Homo-oligomer: A and B are copies of this chain.
Amino acid sequence: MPIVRVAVLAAGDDGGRLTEMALPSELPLREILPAVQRIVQPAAPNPVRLSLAPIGGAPFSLDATLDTVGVVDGDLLALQAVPSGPPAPRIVEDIADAAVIFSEARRRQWGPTHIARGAALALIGLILVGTGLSVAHRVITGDLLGQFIVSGIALATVIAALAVRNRSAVLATSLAVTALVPVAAAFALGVPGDFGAPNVLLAAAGVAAWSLISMAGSPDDRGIAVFTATAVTGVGVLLVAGAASLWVISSDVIGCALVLLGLIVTVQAAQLSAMWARPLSVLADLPRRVRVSQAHQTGVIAAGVLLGVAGSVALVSSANASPWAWYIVVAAAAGAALRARVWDSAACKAWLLGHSYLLAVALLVAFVIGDRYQAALWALAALAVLVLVWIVAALNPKIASPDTYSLPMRRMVGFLATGLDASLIPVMALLVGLFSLVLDR
């Protein structure tokens, strides 16, 4: 005869029990459910008929055996109440009273918590628009008053993201991640005189330190990823701006340096997240540590993508650019899109595949800034092609899955990915005259 060994757990209204079962699977469930009830229960609520269900899906048709319904040996099945019809929707003869009755059936009753959300969002908007208006006043009129306004806003929001870490955690993280804007503005405008490398160096240093300490706090593990992203981005732009400050360097050098940093950060997300991880409980914080490790991976991946696209726009927004620069940009883009195959998180893959889209958009805005409108139209054309690829992959999942492709094709994909993320190096060495630095000194 046929039998099947499946594990079942009763959920119920009390802490259930997971057990194995050796059930014969040739006969309707209705003949075996009482067996499961006898097994997993330790044996009125207006009783309900109980039936097996896939651990995530909806209950089985109660007349279908475990062969004519998707079940394999060793599967996990849950014990759910069979679906039943909703109670007959009450009918209210009047209209106005019917309106007031049927509206409150799902409405949130405005209370203090709505006022709290409103005030938090209002304060966030104030932080943003105050930074914006003050920094505009600074750069435009130079009256040195916007300087004071933004400095005060930065101090206040930092003190605020430090003070409220016991009254609400969300305020802490939210005001910190917004403070990332006014401290950036205050430090970028805080170096006197002309604009250049020192301003961006100070701003990157400030945002790096602020993200570092705010991630040291961590009342909500939601803002870990954002602070990691901004910390690593700040470190990257800090190194680059320190370079461009100590000794003058061209745009191509900055571009290739930033793209290289992005490549290294992306390909070393494992190592970087590893070093980032820095009455009785034994591995009871494992959910927290795992969630934070995922957060750190997503953050540093986002920072890699951002550094890559920043360097690309840097050495991809110049009216004159060697086609080697175009190769660097496009190869970095394809390298990100192809490294998106190695991770297993939706938020890491999203960033790696959005490198290409973000690059298209950033090139678009950059070309629109300069007088290059014809270049912007072509960037927009490439954007259209890219979203077309997105759509075509979304409509036909046969393309989307990796099991459609045989292992030789997958290994060829891997070889191409390594080839691109490698060959970015000598072409970078050729774009900037690094060989000239040794041949002719």
Contact = CB atoms under 8 A, between A and B. Distances in A.
Given A11-B102, A90-B20, A109-B344, A394 B95 contact: no
B1 A109 contact: no
Contacts of A94: 15, 17
A98 interface: yes
The number of times this chain is found in the oligomer is 2
Given A36-B56, A56-B39, A118-B350, A95 B20 contact: no
Interface stretch (A75-83, A246-254, A319-327): A75-83
B346 A109 contact: yes
Contacts of A54: 35
A125 interface: no
Nearest to A81: B1
B98 A9 contact: yes
B393 A106 contact: no
A411 interface: no
Interface string A2-36: 01000001010001111111111000000110011
A407 interface: no
Interface in A72-105: 76, 78-80, 90-98, 101-102, 105
Give me the 5 closest cross-chain CB pairs, A-B, nearest first. A119-B394, A56-B105, A35-B55, A112-B397, A11-B98
25 contacts: A1-B80, A15-B94, A18-B95, A19-B92, A21-B56, A21-B90, A24-B78, A31-B55, A35-B54, A35-B55, A35-B57, A35-B76, A38-B56, A39-B90, A40-B92, A55-B105, A112-B397, A112-B401, A114-B349, A114-B350, A115-B394, A115-B397, A119-B387, A119-B393, A119-B394
A102 B90 contact: no
Given A90-B19, A92-B19, A98-B78, A390 B119 contact: yes
B39 A93 contact: no
Given A19-B93, A20-B90, A36-B56, 17 more contacts: A3-B80, A11-B98, A15-B97, A15-B98, A17-B93, A21-B90, A35-B76, A38-B56, A56-B102, A78-B101, A78-B102, A109-B344, A110-B349, A114-B346, A115-B390, A115-B397, A119-B393
Contacts of A400: 112, 115
A1 B90 contact: no
A423 interface: no
Given A102-B78, A110-B344, A393-B119, A15 B55 contact: no
Interface residues of A, number: 65
B105 A394 contact: no
The majority secondary structure among interface residues of chain A is: mixed
A345 interface: yes
A345 B109 contact: yes
Contact of A15 (B57, B78, B96): B96
Contacts of A55: 23-24, 31-32, 35, 101-102, 105
A353 interface: yes
Contacts of A345: 109-110
A95 B78 CA distance: 12
Contacts of A344: 109-110
A351 to B, nearest CB: 11
Nearest to A114: B346
A116 interface: yes
A277 interface: no
Given A56-B105, A109-B346, A353 B118 contact: yes
B90 A9 contact: no
Nearest to A93: B18
Contact of A115 (B35, B93, B119, B393): B393
Contacts of A11: 98, 102
Contacts of A97: 15
A403 to B, nearest CB: 12
Contacts of A1: 78-80
Contacts of A31: 55, 76
Given A102-B56, A106-B56, A92 B17 contact: yes
Interface string A390-415: 11011101001100000000000000
